[PDB]
Scaffold this active site. Sequence first.
Site, PDB file in Angstrom:
ATOM      1  N   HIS A   1      -4.350   2.860  10.185  1.00 54.04           N
ATOM      2  CA  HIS A   1      -4.464   3.822   9.110  1.00 54.04           C
ATOM      3  C   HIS A   1      -4.040   5.192   9.724  1.00 54.04           C
ATOM      4  O   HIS A   1      -4.869   6.116   9.929  1.00 54.04           O
ATOM      5  CB  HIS A   1      -5.895   3.801   8.651  1.00 54.04           C
ATOM      6  CG  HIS A   1      -6.302   4.497   7.356  1.00 54.04           C
ATOM      7  ND1 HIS A   1      -5.449   5.101   6.549  1.00 54.04           N
ATOM      8  CD2 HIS A   1      -7.586   4.517   6.922  1.00 54.04           C
ATOM      9  CE1 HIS A   1      -6.200   5.521   5.577  1.00 54.04           C
ATOM     10  NE2 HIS A   1      -7.450   5.177   5.800  1.00 54.04           N
TER      11      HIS A   1
ATOM     12  N   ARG B   1     -10.771   7.227  -2.831  1.00 53.36           N
ATOM     13  CA  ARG B   1     -10.746   8.479  -2.054  1.00 53.36           C
ATOM     14  C   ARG B   1      -9.395   8.713  -1.399  1.00 53.36           C
ATOM     15  O   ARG B   1      -8.833   9.806  -1.489  1.00 53.36           O
ATOM     16  CB  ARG B   1     -11.793   8.398  -0.988  1.00 53.36           C
ATOM     17  CG  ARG B   1     -12.740   9.551  -0.675  1.00 53.36           C
ATOM     18  CD  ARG B   1     -13.805   8.923   0.243  1.00 53.36           C
ATOM     19  NE  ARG B   1     -14.987   9.758   0.384  1.00 53.36           N
ATOM     20  CZ  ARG B   1     -16.131   9.559  -0.319  1.00 53.36           C
ATOM     21  NH1 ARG B   1     -16.204   8.551  -1.199  1.00 53.36           N
ATOM     22  NH2 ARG B   1     -17.205  10.371  -0.150  1.00 53.36           N
ATOM     23  N   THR B   2      -8.827   7.687  -0.750  1.00 56.61           N
ATOM     24  CA  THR B   2      -7.524   7.737  -0.084  1.00 56.61           C
ATOM     25  C   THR B   2      -6.443   7.832  -1.144  1.00 56.61           C
ATOM     26  O   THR B   2      -5.473   8.584  -1.017  1.00 56.61           O
ATOM     27  CB  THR B   2      -7.393   6.472   0.770  1.00 56.61           C
ATOM     28  OG1 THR B   2      -8.358   6.635   1.819  1.00 56.61           O
ATOM     29  CG2 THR B   2      -5.994   6.213   1.301  1.00 56.61           C
TER      30      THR B   2
ATOM     31  N   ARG C   1      -1.398   0.492   0.712  1.00 60.27           N
ATOM     32  CA  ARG C   1      -2.614   0.047   1.392  1.00 60.27           C
ATOM     33  C   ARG C   1      -2.731  -1.387   0.918  1.00 60.27           C
ATOM     34  O   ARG C   1      -2.681  -1.647  -0.307  1.00 60.27           O
ATOM     35  CB  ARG C   1      -3.844   0.870   0.952  1.00 60.27           C
ATOM     36  CG  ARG C   1      -5.148   0.409   1.538  1.00 60.27           C
ATOM     37  CD  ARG C   1      -6.399   1.163   1.134  1.00 60.27           C
ATOM     38  NE  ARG C   1      -6.720   2.108   2.178  1.00 60.27           N
ATOM     39  CZ  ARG C   1      -7.934   2.340   2.671  1.00 60.27           C
ATOM     40  NH1 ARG C   1      -8.994   1.703   2.236  1.00 60.27           N
ATOM     41  NH2 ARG C   1      -8.083   3.250   3.624  1.00 60.27           N
TER      42      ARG C   1
ATOM     43  N   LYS D   1       0.683 -14.300  -6.645  1.00 60.29           N
ATOM     44  CA  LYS D   1       0.320 -15.548  -5.987  1.00 60.29           C
ATOM     45  C   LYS D   1       1.547 -16.280  -6.493  1.00 60.29           C
ATOM     46  O   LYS D   1       1.773 -16.555  -7.677  1.00 60.29           O
ATOM     47  CB  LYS D   1      -0.932 -16.316  -6.511  1.00 60.29           C
ATOM     48  CG  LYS D   1      -1.172 -17.545  -5.599  1.00 60.29           C
ATOM     49  CD  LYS D   1      -2.469 -18.365  -5.789  1.00 60.29           C
ATOM     50  CE  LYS D   1      -2.582 -19.415  -4.659  1.00 60.29           C
ATOM     51  NZ  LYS D   1      -3.877 -20.074  -4.632  1.00 60.29           N
TER      52      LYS D   1
END
Lengths: 310, 310, 310, 310, 153, 153
Positions: free
Chosen positions: D134, D54-55, D105, D84
């Site tokens: 946020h 959605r974001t 994000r 990693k």
Amino acid sequence: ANPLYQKHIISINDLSRDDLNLVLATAAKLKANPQPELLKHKVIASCFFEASTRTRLSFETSMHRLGASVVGFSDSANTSLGKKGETLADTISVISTYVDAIVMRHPQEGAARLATEFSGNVPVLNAGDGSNQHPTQTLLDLFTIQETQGRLDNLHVAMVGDLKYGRTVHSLTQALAKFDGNRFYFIAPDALAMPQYILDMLDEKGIAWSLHSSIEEVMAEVDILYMTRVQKERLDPSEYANVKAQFVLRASDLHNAKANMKVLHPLPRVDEIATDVDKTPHAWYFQQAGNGIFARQALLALVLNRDLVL
Amino acid sequence: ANPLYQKHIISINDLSRDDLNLVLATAAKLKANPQPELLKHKVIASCFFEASTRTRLSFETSMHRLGASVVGFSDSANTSLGKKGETLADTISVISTYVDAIVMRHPQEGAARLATEFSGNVPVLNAGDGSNQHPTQTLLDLFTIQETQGRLDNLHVAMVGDLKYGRTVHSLTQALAKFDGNRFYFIAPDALAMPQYILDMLDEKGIAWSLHSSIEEVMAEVDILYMTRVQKERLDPSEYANVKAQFVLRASDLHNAKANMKVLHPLPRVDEIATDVDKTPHAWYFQQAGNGIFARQALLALVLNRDLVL
Amino acid sequence: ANPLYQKHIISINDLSRDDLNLVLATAAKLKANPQPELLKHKVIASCFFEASTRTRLSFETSMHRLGASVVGFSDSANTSLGKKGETLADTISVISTYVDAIVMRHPQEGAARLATEFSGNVPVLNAGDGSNQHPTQTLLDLFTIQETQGRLDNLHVAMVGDLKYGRTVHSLTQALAKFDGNRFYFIAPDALAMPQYILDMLDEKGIAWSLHSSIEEVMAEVDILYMTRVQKERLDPSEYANVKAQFVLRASDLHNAKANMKVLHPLPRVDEIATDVDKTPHAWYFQQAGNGIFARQALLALVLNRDLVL
Amino acid sequence: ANPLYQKHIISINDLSRDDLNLVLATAAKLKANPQPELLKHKVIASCFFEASTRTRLSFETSMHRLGASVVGFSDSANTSLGKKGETLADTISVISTYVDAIVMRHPQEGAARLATEFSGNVPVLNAGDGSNQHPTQTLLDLFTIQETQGRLDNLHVAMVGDLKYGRTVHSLTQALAKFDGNRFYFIAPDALAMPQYILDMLDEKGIAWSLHSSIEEVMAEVDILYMTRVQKERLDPSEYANVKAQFVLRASDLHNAKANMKVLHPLPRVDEIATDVDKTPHAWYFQQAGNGIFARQALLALVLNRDLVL
Amino acid sequence: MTHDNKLQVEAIKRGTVIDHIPAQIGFKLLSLFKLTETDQRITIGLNLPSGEMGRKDLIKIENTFLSEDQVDQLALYAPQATVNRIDNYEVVGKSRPSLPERIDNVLVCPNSNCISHAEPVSSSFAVRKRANDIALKCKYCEKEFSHNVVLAN
Amino acid sequence: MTHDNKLQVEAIKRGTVIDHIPAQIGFKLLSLFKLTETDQRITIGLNLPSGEMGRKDLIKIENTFLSEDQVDQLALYAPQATVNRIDNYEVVGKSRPSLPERIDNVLVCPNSNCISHAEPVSSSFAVRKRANDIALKCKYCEKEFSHNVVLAN
Ligand SMILES: Nc1ccn([C@@H]2O[C@H](COP(=O)(O)OP(=O)(O)OP(=O)(O)O)[C@@H](O)[C@H]2O)c(=O)n1
Ligand SMILES: Nc1ccn([C@@H]2O[C@H](COP(=O)(O)OP(=O)(O)OP(=O)(O)O)[C@@H](O)[C@H]2O)c(=O)n1
Ligand SMILES: [Zn+2]
Ligand SMILES: [Zn+2]
């Protein structure tokens, strides 16, 4: 025939004081003279629908130490059951068609008592049902308080840790409330406090309890210090860390402990009890786990045997 | 009480010539008259933290052939241990609270010897610790060289394959170096050569060895030809293929083998020994695996028994 | 048209010295005076059947700085094409009816060359095909060597690390061997050394190479130090950790390097280059990754546009 | 230049009242008279190391309505960067040589602030970093509150749900506390209540807050009702289901709300808002999610463009 | 008195004086051997002048006698250190460190798959002077490494 | 040169003396603020008798003058220390530490999920509220902890 004969051990709330003493005196006898063929020719199912190694290896060793055979599965990671929508009523109606007792752990609360409606006459013993009961962990803890303290009444028992969601402290407070004059000290982060239905039952029975914020406030008076693990996800990383990670025991804190005080932890312990506590005389967490064998053996001996020889 | 009584079998470097002979003469006796109740009432833990079927089924059959009970887990694919950060010191302090010997395999090197610091008096027998030891594979290979060759000294032993990372050829060269006059022939791709610490120990003990590039250079003189698998990822696909996939045995190559020569492979064999070798008298890889039962049985009999009856 | 117009870019082996200089010439032009509407209305496909997000973002940013459209995918454990059953040949045959160019990275060698027989008039550009080729990495490495040193001939280039399996070090040596008088130093662990084919080619060309054991012995004579990552799977942990006092670079080691010496690395650089190198003037791996934009802009511009007048 | 030109947008804590009003002013401008070629030729990177589609779609649609190009990725169990071994710092150092801005994000807190020290002159915009910040959610919430109520001062805002862990409710309270005379009502389950730091800050500012137990007791005085989702993992099923007659909203509950009262929710809204609310005039969560386009267009326009004359 | 050396510094009544620590080993040894976890007076000198041996360090620890085993530990680090005990204002014994047979506790296994890394275990290496070096074999792994690889870490 | 002795050792020419360090903070400060990575002569006295704390620690670093903010970094460890700066055997300066506004490098964010654990960034905390008891806020995760808590892990 003994009272427990052919009963289902599903909940601590269903066992009386009498019932609990009987299990504990049989554990003491089997720990003292082994009975390696008592369950000879019995076959017992070890159904762990949810995996739990600690509990399974313990339950099956004690079935093995009384001479019984074990068939079973550990799942969580697939072992074909519930395959193609098969209900648990149906799995149990088929397993009880050929084993002599079902030991089971299951994710949902209530699952061992449902097994009971479908198992006919094969006893069902509960090794954990979600956040509800775990009798055999409370029987082993009780056995260990009794063997080290000499009694189960008139104790000062501190319960330290996550008390809100620790399914074992909730049952041990109910079992101990069956006995007299015990005093409880709860030491928990505010977010992890001992729920009201517990406190409300203690008040109604006139049993004394109190909240403290550090173990130093109560160490001197304490007989059994029962630690539980805080699971770091019941808190965020910084809540755990920030000032609440101080429900941690270390050797230094034990200075003024009474000579009889014992430290109990159902395990995995990871953070809460520092490794230097192990060398002290009060560390009884491992000997508590070994007592799981006699408590567990005693329940299978009492439930499968009409009359017991001792 | 026998020397091995209640010892931990962790490394081949810890067993003497004497110790190795004793295990081998007990294997020979149990292979000749079974003792099916010798470990009656013992419960043994089969902890395979890393899965290995071949080794597990073998170890548990031999526990079953001496009358013992087995509780345990195979993991790699989840069986709830190390759950929530539980250390291996702690798992072993709890398992030794109720079994009589721990057999264990683990991914990290050193893990069976650590178990030893926490198991109290319950013997720990190592079924493999990462790239370090696997005693019970060397005991079975030795038993098989002895039973087919009649001796363990004065042998011409060829080791063919991946010698750099084959954990079993490294221990069998150390065990055989305990005995006299053996001669070693190593046949390996350049990338997969027998490491220096091995060669350096052979030189220092005055034992003869030599590198050859094909088995035809040495077939005539050879008593034991021990093949190992090259794992195709220790090389790229084209390195394997390109000219190094010729460390492969076939029936044709066996023409001039001495009548006593035997082919040994700890298994899975996949490429290296062609299927037509199976029909020859020299194929002893499968009978080598069956000897795992007596070697393994002998170690559990010697370690749990003060005195042995034969 | 330009020599590379509509050509397929699959192996460094297939581009002449001259084609290598044309690309590098163009890329300096685009870096200096950018032309953001050059591929306006073209649609490129970014078929990464093997994920590499660094390479994928470099290419898609190259496509968008020239104004082109992008459709495509990546596939760490995911999305349908190539399926298993559906061939690469049919995937390409279908995609080359939709787009104007195909950049592709696949896990099996020669996938890009197979593609070329199925894309019709559509050009395919290799972004990596198993352990075979990755020409757009060599093109940016040479652009960085030419942009810091002023030429691509008469250089003392040190290559360090996994020379046996770095595809980038095999390629860079072929490409630098089309220019004149270059001298090569190869500092590698002898288990991971330069293949005999790179060396046999270099001696047929009359080129000078020498092999060294630690960077400290050539630090003084060197222009480009091309570090590679040592791939710890192709090694034992103990082997990995054993080598000398390592072949990792730190600022202390740099105190003798020429002022124009630059350290290059295709990235990732987990361990072999310490953070203190990042602040020296010799560090150029990040700048090397930005030149990836201008090298791949150049290739796309020459392949899709008939002649270029920038 | 404009005050935010080339600035990093990481915490709501770092934007003054004035910067908050500038953004909101711009976003009303872009909503009214759109400028689709404003970031023509810019290439933004959409680095979602944690998937949130959605974001991600809101931001990429914001990038494309201003004519910008987009490269990037998402990573529910997938694609290479950060690896990693490969650090975030090296990922950013390499990507900030390719693009003009980075929206990111990440699951660990402060990742965006770390990024800022490695992106060079490239601006980074935080789309969520663990439980910390946020800011583009707070910016659209204020734009929706300002667009429905007419101001951002003197509001009676009710915040409901998981006030302890909604990052959005912590932020919205800091931001609304830079404007004047706002009164806050916090209706939460006492196990999930507003942290003492939000409240201690609010009392240092002289702001009025009160805590309530069900929305029905403030429904009458309220302007904005900001529902949050109650996160059922941080709860026991029985706990989750126990609370009062719940804190979910239905149209029946709305029959007293002021005519300008709007219900906001960051979404998803599994349970706490019933479908019948969707048809009332007070429902504004979907319109709130469309204003996400104009709030993020605004931020990108001011950060990448020197001064704006729309 | 003067050609500086002493100028008033610490003569002690009883204790151990470790002298000629090679420069920069001086602080290693305090850390590693946990010599400051004491209440007794310690007086330390770093980058002490040693026209006599370049430059050195020196710890003086009183009413404590560091012996046998404790002295041989230090050999991997300060192999030319002369420990001196004092029981009434002068050297009662000078003791050089000899290499021991085992080095416990202070050393890490280079092997990242070694179980010593994740567990409550005290490290332990068997020492072996193989001329040109000391090899150190881990008691858990049983992997053998050059002392230079282990001390580097 | 001046008649040193060990109950309160004497005179360095030119340099810094950090005196009135609480017992057992002195080594902590040597290791934490890396004071030892210099070629200068440092003299250090541990668990000494003096000016009423009874027992203290002291560090003497000749020719180095560490100041103003360096001295302040010492504040939650040795708040009651004095940093005398010496020149030609005269104490030409007496500072005491005050709470800094930022404490870089030395601390560890107790928040296991912040990014600072895994990376080439050094810690940084904003300090708040003098002596009634200090709050430290991580630069990166912006989580505020009690100093008592950052100062354990
Ligand atoms: N009451 C005393 C006596 C001796 N020492 C110390 O003990 C050490 C022993 O050295 P010593 O045998 O007295 O003469 P050196 O020649 O310095 O010893 P070396 O041969 O190692 O140089 C000296 O550093 C001295 O400071 C001391 O602190 N207190
Ligand atoms: N050239 C000098 C002069 C003084 N000192 C040290 O400086 C410290 C204290 O300075 P000073 O003011 O001279 O003595 P005090 O008045 O006792 O200082 P305070 O009251 O702050 O303890 C003493 O520990 C002393 O060893 C030194 O090492 N070298
Ligand atoms: Zn090791
Ligand atoms: Zn932090």
